[PDB]
Amino acid sequence: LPVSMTKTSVDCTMYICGDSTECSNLLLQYGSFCTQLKRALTGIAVEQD
Amino acid sequence: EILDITPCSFGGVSVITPGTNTSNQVAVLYQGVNCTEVPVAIHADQLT
Numbered sequence: 001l002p003v004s005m006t007k008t009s010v011d012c013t014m015y016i017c018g019d020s021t022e023c024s025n026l027l028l029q030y031g032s033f034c035t036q037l038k039r040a041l042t043g044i045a046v047e048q049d
Numbered sequence: 050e051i052l053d054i055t056p057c058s059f060g061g062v063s064v065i066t067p068g069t070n071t072s073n074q075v076a077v078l079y080q081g082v083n084c085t086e087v088p089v090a091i092h093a094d095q096l097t
Binding site for chain 1: 080
């Protein structure tokens with residue numbers, strides 16, 4: 001029987017824009033998607049513990 | 050001359066605090082990096 005799974009945290013800025021696109025500051029115009037995904041990932045991480 | 054392109058050293062910053070009702074000291078956690086890849090530029094913090 002499984003108990004826990006892999007806890008994953010995702011950096012949305014490096015995934016969507018990248019580590020080389022400093023001109024991609026338009027992700028702040030979309031609002032708070034990264035916060036509401038990081039909250040769900042943090043809840044999953046504290047649930048697996 | 051062919052060269053690898055490895056990305057920059059990055060990670061997540063997690064602040065550990067006992068609460069503002071107790072004290073104001075905080076401890077940071079740089080997730081996924083070594084003790085040498087953390088910024089040792091504390092003497093030059095005004096350069097950002």
